[PDB]
Design a protein around this ligand. Structure first.
Ligand code: CLA
Ligand code: CLA
Ligand code: CLA
Ligand code: CLA
Ligand code: CLA
Ligand code: CLA
Ligand code: CLA
Ligand code: KC2
Ligand SMILES: CC1=C(C#C/C(C)=C/C=C/C(C)=C/C=C/C=C(C)/C=C/C=C(C)/C=C/[C@@]23O[C@]2(C)C[C@@H](O)CC3(C)C)C(C)(C)C[C@H](O)C1
Ligand SMILES: CC1=C(C#C/C(C)=C/C=C/C(C)=C/C=C/C=C(C)/C=C/C=C(C)/C=C/[C@@]23O[C@]2(C)C[C@@H](O)CC3(C)C)C(C)(C)C[C@H](O)C1
Ligand SMILES: CC1=C(C/C=C(\C)CCC[C@H](C)CCC[C@H](C)CCCC(C)C)C(=O)c2ccccc2C1=O
Lengths: 134, 184, 665, 221, 173
């Protein structure tokens, strides 16, 4: 966003515009101001504060190589659809509904059904709903 | 103009901002009658790697220029040796297999080329820039004018590309025909 | 990048990594904690970048260690081995790249392997591996050793460098898509294609010449030349008793192509069901999650290797090298078990340190049904053996479960190879023979299933009840490795995932011991042996086919397998070949018994005894200022477990190897 | 469509959103009749899916209950195996299915709104959930399409078996059938290489007279 | 929006198929006209390739150099290249095709500078054509569908004919 200094006119070499957009979308909004130390956004902030227009316009070959190694590529970050799917999954689980699955060979299949996992008594572990008994 | 490598290396390294020119204004994009900016796949959009791309292009052009002449000359003349004679090796395309392995004739060439490349890697990586890409200081006969230097660089690039394609054509034709120079 | 911060000053600090060890050496518990937490990089001083640095550099250092071990193996083969005699005549000469000194009469250990060589017979199959690779010269083995040493040096340098090359910004280890794609396409696909190329270009001509009988240097320095149209595996090399190496090379080419194709379709996004795995993708981006998954994968692959290396013969003469095949199977089965329990451990650690998946929220039904299936499996499977024992003792064989009596036919155990009738033989030995399944196989397989399920029960309970349980609700606060929560609530001993592993290791060892005994006895009785003369052969097996008649009873297992086949190891003292194996049998018994000390006793008795002993030292003015302490509870459990498993494994190792060595020579 | 027809709309035709009804059978029906028609369709589809599974299973061999009951290997043709089976087993099967039907229709009858809901999913299921992980319509349409295909397949198999004695023999090739040769495994194969009638000629000519250090290209032969 | 409004996505079986998994259209907008020209060229070459794979069995050209009855899809090109350079009927065909191609340079400039998305592949032939714009668009979609099918069909026919020696219409062993 415009209010963020280091996110303004980030040079394409340091990070591509599309990859930057994807990284910002993936990262929580509240972390844009001052991201945690171990994040791609933190690396981008630290290196954009030092490199770019009005600052060091050149870098050693090895320094640039390491920067491109430790910055994220586009395909590493989650997509819009993937983030939506994960958010829906978490929302379902927190609401007390379970996207039904049955264990299979060394895994479990999703049957495409949403069941009401929590029973009438929410805190009662005896009342969790299942097709076998409920 | 071209400055001495010592001065040119003052501003060297992976640039981050981009001169807004096609391929950062490097020579070799010039049509016969006008301007020919050939980059359909947009490789030059990686401005940081553009110097590396030009270094690689010039290396390939020079190597293929040598290789084409080395495919042409052997059939007309050979080293005065028994293992280089036309009877031992009929055509240049046979040289790789004839001299590979325990004979060491090609192993020595590979060894010396590897030593040279190990010594030049420092320039290739560290001291590479838009102005010193492909410049090893061997500027004898280089014109002392901006236009002359640009034209000489363009001629080198054009001949290098022509030989780059011509070596592929010649090697493929020679393998297909098992024939002397004309088909290579 | 800054290497001025690597100094030997910290070498003498001995505990710098752990902040809890700052008050250096007030007791011996400090020493023990130093050792225990040496490699627990997560809880050590620093940051996540440092954790990644240590993990990667340690992986590279271990890579260098393995390369050093392989180079040592190659050097021993080259200079301290009878590989020349074995290559010219594998059958007569047993593999031996191992020589012992003559210090205290220790030269007795070396046994006759060839006319000019005396040493210890190796059982790793390295000679067969060299023969398959086409290594037929001391120069070739020497250059392999040199390559291994160079790789060791390179890996050591890489570890040392990466300890500083990777900075806090380093993130290449979090690029899971890039990592997986690179490993799948290059490490596996290109690797398999390149090894197929190596086989085709080097091993195939050399192996064909060796099969023919040609040993000419010019020849040693036309694919599918000898292989007929017969399906691979349906026809073994008559002169070698193994799958054709050209078929193996074609296999590797096909596998590499398949791996490259899988990688390319993943690259193109052809795979579509990403959502079904997205939950795992988000949850398991953790060091311990990946470690657990990889450990389980490699455990399963090790078990499959153990089975296939024997059932499907691919190395020259390994089929007839009975000690080699047996040792390979047993070793890889043991590694499978160990890495599976490791996967359980690190699953528990991941659950403790990170948020678990949602299958933990109905953990009670899961573990309850697993408990029931374990109980039912154990009851039925082992009670069939107990029923057989009781009825046979009473004198009613007609009432027992056996082929002659009531029989439990394994109807589902059906063939898939479709082999031709008969067996495959090579110079007085049975390289390949079909295993005929009956009541004994049914019973033993269900015993296997029971033990596997109980081990899985222990591991899964530890994983699922790691964060909390009805007993204790703050197990997450307690952590991963704690002894208990107290004598309260009846007693909370061994409620931690660490203790759950401590028990799952016992159960894995029990399972693997039963598996080893089953494989050993079945192979000796029904597969291995010699033959006595369209021709029909009467096959004389080493155990005389007693598995199907005696294995139906626990007494039969005790008598015909342990007592009867311990004659070699028990009577090995005078024999030069296996006296070491007899001594190791005895010493492993001792160590196993010694483990019971720690497994049964408790901390307080030893602490009080130590204080009473220290009274005398103080009286005589011998005051150790690193105050002696009894081993912690978890350490006592760990020591007991280690000694128990080591002693049992040593007894089994010596017993089986002595039997095989004596029988084959 | 109609208000009654909408009770099942979205679960038919090639695409789920179509309503295939060339005969117009459901045009005049009421909602209860449409639900009963769907219940009949689903029961027939499920029975047909199980029937095809069992038919192929028995046509591959793998007919152990019959083998053990008769003390002999029953004919692979399922229609012949029916006659080869003992009346004991036949009446046991009929009685078991009768008991299943009685329990499902009298003891645990499905709701009138969802007559096809045998297992009572519509007591803990939330079909009208706006989450992405709610592909119950996809599951239902998959069920219906597979069941329809299985109905057609089983009718075709039975008709072809009755007419030309062809039961759609399966060539599983692992346990009941012992395939000795690569040709048996893959039709038309006779060797390691695929059976292509094209002799791959050399892309480049070779030297008639060789030279020292040639290393002529290898032949896969 | 999609591509450059070019025909080739509408009038499908279900109406609006937008086939572009690998985002070439978005990645190289400047090459969309070139892509359309290349697609139309490949389709119109594959149609004639199939028809000329079939017809030769029935008929042969008047000149006395293609009358051999063994000129199947496999040996035809190599046999007809003939000796030297610029001497065979294959060379006559190459020269004719080049003469035809050179008119496209007149139409869209020397360097295809004028090649746009709304004139890519259009050579100005308007004989036996729909009068209405909608009809013209429908015929362009027919043409694109037929060309894509002919490309796939000629690829399959050639591959099968060489692999299994069936060089004639069935193209099946
Ligand atoms: C570490 C050992 C291990 C192994 C060897 C496997 C193996 C497998 N898992 Mg996985 N899985 C594991 C652990 C493991 N899993 C764990 C710990 C979990 C719990 C989170 C899962 C959860 C999981 C799911 C959710 C799924 C799998 C599935 C699969 C299958 C994927 C390949 C496939 O379908 O090919 C065939 C395709 C062509 C395969 C059998 C898939 C499956 O079908 O499982 C039945 C699947 O959807 N697994
Ligand atoms: C997996 C690694 C490994 C292992 C387990 C062994 C094991 C052995 N090697 Mg060694 N060896 C290795 C790698 C290994 N080697 C490598 C990489 C090389 C060089 C490539 C050698 C070269 C080598 C030679 C040349 C010889 C041995 C010998 C031996 C044996 C006696 C060692 C001895 O007397 O030590 C003595 C004890 C010490 C050196 C003390 C070590 C600790 C202090 C601090 C030093 C022993 C079985 C000897 C042998 O078999 O003789 C019959 C022998 O002559 N090895
Ligand atoms: C598991 C094996 C492994 C892996 C995954 C990596 C990964 C990496 N190495 Mg390498 N490295 C390895 C083994 C490995 N290394 C070994 C054994 C050595 C010792 C010879 C080195 C020595 C080494 C150096 C000296 C450097 C790297 C660098 C790199 C980076 C890759 C950039 C590059 O040049 O790629 C092309 C291949 C990355 C952190 C470079 C880096 O981090 O640059 C910023 C770098 O400078 N590595
Ligand atoms: C060029 C083709 C080719 C060839 C010649 C082989 C050859 C071999 N494979 Mg196979 N394999 C191939 C492709 C091939 N593979 C492919 C594409 C894959 C998938 C990645 C595999 C995956 C695979 C695995 C996982 C294993 C083998 C194994 C083997 C060995 C024993 C197989 C056997 O006895 O089967 C018997 C033959 C039949 C039952 C006939 C059926 C053949 C097809 C299905 C028809 C043998 C060296 C085994 C091995 O290495 O054992 C030590 C083994 O475990 N292969
Ligand atoms: C038990 C059989 C059965 C039943 C009860 C139904 C019922 C239904 N189907 Mg139908 N359907 C069936 C089988 C059946 N289907 C099969 C096998 C197929 C595959 C071709 C389909 C394919 C299909 C589609 C694609 C769609 C439906 C739909 C419907 C619904 C509305 C149309 C209608 O009136 O159908 C009533 C059907 C009948 C009364 C069946 C009459 C059969 C006649 C008499 C011919 C039978 C001959 C047959 C070939 C066997 C000959 C064997 C002999 C030679 C030995 C309705 C609930 C629609 C829907 O659900 O929309 C939401 C819809 O779109 N069905
Ligand atoms: C090689 C021939 C060829 C060429 C040049 C094109 C070109 C085009 N196709 Mg494609 N297409 C082809 C073959 C080809 N097609 C075939 C065989 C089929 C049938 C399966 C289709 C089916 C198809 C559809 C259904 C659609 C297109 C569309 C397009 C346009 C946008 C996609 C794009 O940028 O592709 C660029 C392609 C290449 C650079 C060729 C790469 C080929 C491999 C990677 C080598 C573009 C003009 C879209 C369109 O017309 O939108 C208006 C569209 O909707 N095509
Ligand atoms: C666009 C694809 C295409 C290609 C690559 C070829 C290629 C060929 N055709 Mg032609 N041909 C084509 C389309 C094509 N044809 C079509 C659409 C028709 C239908 C009118 C024909 C009808 C045809 C006949 C009747 C004959 C050829 C023949 C030939 C050969 C000589 C060409 C020549 O001298 O032309 C001159 C201009 C050559 C293999 C000759 C041959 O030997 O075929 C095997 C031949 O007799 N073609
Ligand atoms: C991921 C989904 C997907 C897959 C995996 C897939 C695979 C195959 C295969 C290989 C297995 C073949 C051989 C094939 C062939 C055709 N597909 Mg198809 N296809 C998919 C999706 C769509 C969509 C959305 C449409 C479509 C179409 C056509 C047309 C007709 C075009 C026409 O005449 O307009 C033909 C010939 C369009 C249409 O209208 O079909 C009537 C259309 O809109 N496809 N398709
Ligand atoms: C002999 C031998 C060996 C070998 C070998 C070697 C060295 C082989 C080398 C092969 C080599 C070097 C092969 C080049 C190919 C170039 C191609 C295909 C160019 C195409 C170009 C195309 C299709 C188009 C180009 C243009 O469209 C562009 C892009 C823009 C336009 O404005 C202009 C044109 C239209 C022109 C061994 C292995 C060493 C030993 C062994 O014993 C046998
Ligand atoms: C599954 C799927 C799809 C797909 C797909 C896939 C996998 C498509 C693959 C297509 C593929 C693989 C197409 C090959 C063509 C090969 C050709 C044209 C070869 C010509 C060869 C020629 C012209 C050779 C000629 C000669 O050699 C001859 C014969 C004799 C010699 O003397 C002379 C010469 C050299 C001149 C859709 C449909 C795209 C979308 C859908 O959604 C999903
Ligand atoms: C014996 C015992 C002790 C006492 C054991 C101690 C203190 C171990 C002694 C450590 C010594 C000093 C380490 C040095 C190694 C051995 C002396 C090496 C001997 C090697 C021989 C070959 C000579 C415990 O503290 C304990 C705690 C909890 C559960 C069980 C037990 C337990 O069983």
């Amino acid at each position: 966003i415009s209010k963020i200094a280091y996110l303004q006119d980030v040079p394409r070499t340091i990070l591509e515009a599309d990859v930057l957009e994807k990284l910002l979308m993936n990262t929580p909004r509240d972390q844009w101001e001052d991201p945690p130390e171990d994040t791609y956004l933190y690396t981008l902030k630290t290196f954009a504060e030092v490199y770019g227009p009005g600052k060091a316009t050149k870098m050693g070959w090895w320094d640039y190589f390491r920067l491109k190694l430790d910055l994220p590529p586009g395909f590493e970050l989650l997509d819009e659809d993937e983030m939506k799917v994960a958010a829906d999954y978490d929302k379902l689980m927190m609401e007390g509904k379970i996207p039904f699955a049955v264990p299979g060979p060394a895994g479990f299949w999703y049957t495409g059904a949403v069941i009401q996992w929590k029973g009438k008594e929410q805190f009662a572990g005896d009342q969790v709903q299942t097709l076998t008994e409920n | 103009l071209r400055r001495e490598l010592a001065i040119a290396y003052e501003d060297s390294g992976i640039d981050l901002l981009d001169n807004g020119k096609f391929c950062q204004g490097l020579a070799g994009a010039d049509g016969a009658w006008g301007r020919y900016e050939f980059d359909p796949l947009g490789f030059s959009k990686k401005t940081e790697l553009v110097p590396y791309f030009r270094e690689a292009e010039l290396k390939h052009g020079r190597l293929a220029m040598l290789a084409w002449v080395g495919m042409v000359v052997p059939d007309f003349v050979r080293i005065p040796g028994e293992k280089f004679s036309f009877e031992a090796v009929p055509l240049p395309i046979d040289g790789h297999d004839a001299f590979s392995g325990a004979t060491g004739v090609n192993a020595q060439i590979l060894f010396w080329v590897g030593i040279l490349e190990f010594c030049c890697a420092k320039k290739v990586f560290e001291w590479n820039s838009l102005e010193v890409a492909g410049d090893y200081g061997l500027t004898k006969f280089f014109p002392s004018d901006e236009e002359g230097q640009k034209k000489m660089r363009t001629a080198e690039l054009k001949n290098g590309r022509l030989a780059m394609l011509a070596f592929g054509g010649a090697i493929t034709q020679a393998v297909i025909t098992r024939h002397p120079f004309p088909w290579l | 990048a800054i290497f001025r911060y690597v100094n030997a000053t910290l070498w003498s600090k001995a505990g710098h990594f752990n902040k809890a060890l700052s008050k250096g050496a007030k007791t011996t518990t400090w020493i023990w904690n130093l050792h225990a937490s040496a490699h627990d990089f997560d809880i050590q001083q620093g940051s996540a970048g440092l954790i990644a640095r240590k993990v990667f550099s340690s992986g590279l250092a271990h890579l260098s260690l393995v390369f050093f071990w392989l180079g040592g193996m190659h050097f021993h083969g080259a200079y301290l081995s009878n590989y020349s005699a074995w290559l010219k005549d594998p059958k007569s000469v047993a593999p031996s790249s191992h020589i012992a000194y003559s210090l205290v009469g220790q030269d007795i250990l070396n046994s006759y392997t060839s006319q000019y060589f005396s040493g210890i017979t190796i059982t790793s199959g390295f000679f067969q591996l060299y023969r398959s690779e086409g290594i037929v010269t001391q120069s070739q083995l020497k250059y392999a050793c040199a390559a291994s040493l160079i790789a060791t040096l390179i890996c050591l340098s890489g570890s040392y460098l990466h300890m500083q090359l990777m900075s806090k910004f380093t993130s290449f280890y979090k690029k899971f898509q890039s990592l997986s794609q690179s490993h799948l396409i290059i490490m596996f696909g290109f690797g398999s294609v390149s090894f197929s190329a190596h086989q085709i270009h080097e091993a195939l001509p050399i192996n064909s010449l060796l099969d023919s009988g040609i040993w000419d240097p010019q020849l040693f320095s036309a694919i599918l030349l000898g292989t007929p149209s017969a399906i691979t595996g349906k026809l073994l090399n008559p002169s070698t008793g193994s799958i054709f190496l050209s078929q193996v090379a074609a296999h590797h080419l096909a596998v590499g192509i398949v791996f490259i194709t899988l990688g390319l379709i993943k690259w193109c996004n052809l795979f579509f069901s990403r959502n079904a795995i997205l939950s795992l993708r988000l949850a398991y981006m953790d060091y311990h999650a990946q470690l657990s998954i990889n450990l389980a994968v490699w455990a399963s692959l090790s078990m499959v290797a153990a089975h296939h290396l024997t059932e499907i013969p691919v190395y020259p003469y390994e089929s007839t090298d009975y000690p080699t095949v047996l040792c390979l199977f047993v070793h890889h089965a043991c590694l499978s078990g160990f890495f599976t329990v490791a996967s359980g451990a690190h699953a528990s650690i991941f659950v403790i340190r990170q948020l678990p998946t949602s299958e933990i929220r109905h953990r009670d039904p899961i573990i309850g049904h697993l408990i029931w299936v374990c109980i039912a499996l154990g009851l039925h499977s082992f009670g069939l053996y107990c029923h057989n024992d009781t009825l046979e003792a009473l004198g009613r064989p007609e009432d027992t479960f056996c082929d002659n009596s009531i029989q439990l036919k394994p109807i589902f155990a059906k063939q898939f190879l479709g082999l031709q009738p008969g067996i495959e033989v090579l110079d007085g030995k049975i390289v390949r023979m079909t295993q005929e399944l009956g009541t004994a196989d049914f019973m033993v397989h269900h015993i296997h299933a029971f033990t596997i399920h109980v081990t899985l029960l222990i591991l899964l309970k530890g994983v699922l009840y790691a964060r909390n349980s009805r007993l204790v609700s703050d197990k997450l606060e307690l952590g991963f490795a704690y002894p208990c929560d107290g004598p309260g609530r009846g007693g909370t001993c061994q409620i931690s995932p660490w203790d759950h592993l401590f028990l799952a290791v016992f159960w894995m060892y029990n399972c693997l011991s039963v598996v080893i005994f089953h494989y050993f006895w079945k192979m000796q009785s029904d597969v291995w042996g010699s033959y006595v003369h369209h021709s029909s052969l009467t096959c004389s097996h080493y155990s005389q086919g007693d598995f199907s008649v005696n294995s139906i009873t626990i007494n039969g297992w005790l008598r015909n397998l342990l007592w009867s086949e311990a004659s070699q190891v028990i009577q090995s003292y005078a024999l030069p070949s296996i006296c070491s194996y007899g001594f190791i049998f005895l010493a492993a018994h001792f160590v196993w018994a010694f483990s019971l000390m720690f497994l049964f006793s408790g901390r307080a008795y030893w602490q009080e005894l130590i204080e009473s002993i220290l009274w005398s030292h103080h009286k005589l003015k011998i005051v150790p200022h690193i105050q002696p302490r009894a081993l912690s509870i978890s350490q006592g459990r760990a020591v007991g477990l280690t000694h128990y498993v080591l002693g049992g494994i040593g007894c089994t190792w010596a017993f089986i190897i002595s039997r095989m060595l004596v029988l084959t020579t | 469509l109609t208000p009654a027809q909408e009770s099942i709309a979205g679960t038919g035709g090639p695409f789920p959103e179509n309503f295939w009804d060339p005969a117009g059978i459901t045009s005049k029906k009421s909602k209860e009749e449409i639900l009963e028609l769907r219940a009949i369709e689903l029961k027939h589809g499920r029975v047909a899916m199980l029937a095809v599974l069992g038919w192929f299973h028995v046509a591959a061999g793998f007919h152990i209950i019959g083998d053990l009951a008769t003390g002999t290997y029953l004919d692979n043709n399922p229609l012949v195996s029916v006659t080869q089976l003992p009346m004991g087993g036949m009446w046991q099967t009929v009685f078991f299915i009768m008991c299943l039907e009685w329990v499902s229709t009298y003891v645990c009858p499905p709701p009138k709104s969802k007559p096809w809901d045998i297992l009572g999913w519509s007591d803990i299921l939330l079909e009208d959930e706006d989450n992405y992980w709610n592909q119950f319509r996809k599951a239902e349409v998959q069920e219906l399409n597979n069941g329809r295909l299985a109905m057609m397949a089983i009718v075709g198999l039975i008709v072809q078996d009755i007419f030309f004695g062809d039961f759609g023999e399966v060539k599983v090739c692992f346990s009941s059938q012992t395939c000795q040769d690569i040709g048996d495994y893959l039709p038309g194969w006779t060797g390691p290489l695929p059976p292509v009638a094209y002799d791959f000629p050399p892309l480049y000519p070779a030297p008639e007279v060789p030279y020292t250090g040639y290393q002529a290209p290898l032949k896969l032969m | 929006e999609f591509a450059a409004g070019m025909a080739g996505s509408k009038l499908h079986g279900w109406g609006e198929y937008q086939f572009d998994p690998a985002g070439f259209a978005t990645s190289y907008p400047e090459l969309l006209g070139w892509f359309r020209e290349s697609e139309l060229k490949h389709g119109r070459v594959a149609m004639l390739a199939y028809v000329g794979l079939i017809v030769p069995d029935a008929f042969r050209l008047p000149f006395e150099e293609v009358q051999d009855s063994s000129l199947d899809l496999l040996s035809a090109h190599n046999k007809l290249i003939g000796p030297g350079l610029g001497e065979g009927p294959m060379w006559w065909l190459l020269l004719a095709c080049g003469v035809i191609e050179s008119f496209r340079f007149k139409q869209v400039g020397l360097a295809f500078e004028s090649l746009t998305t709304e004139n890519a592949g259009d050579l100005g032939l308007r004989m036996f054509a729909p009068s209405s714009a909608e009809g013209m668009e429908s015929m362009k979609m027919k043409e694109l569908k037929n060309g894509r099918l002919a490309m796939l069909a000629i690829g399959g026919a050639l591959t099968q004919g060489v692999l299994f020696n069936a060089h004639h219409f069935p193209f099946m062993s």
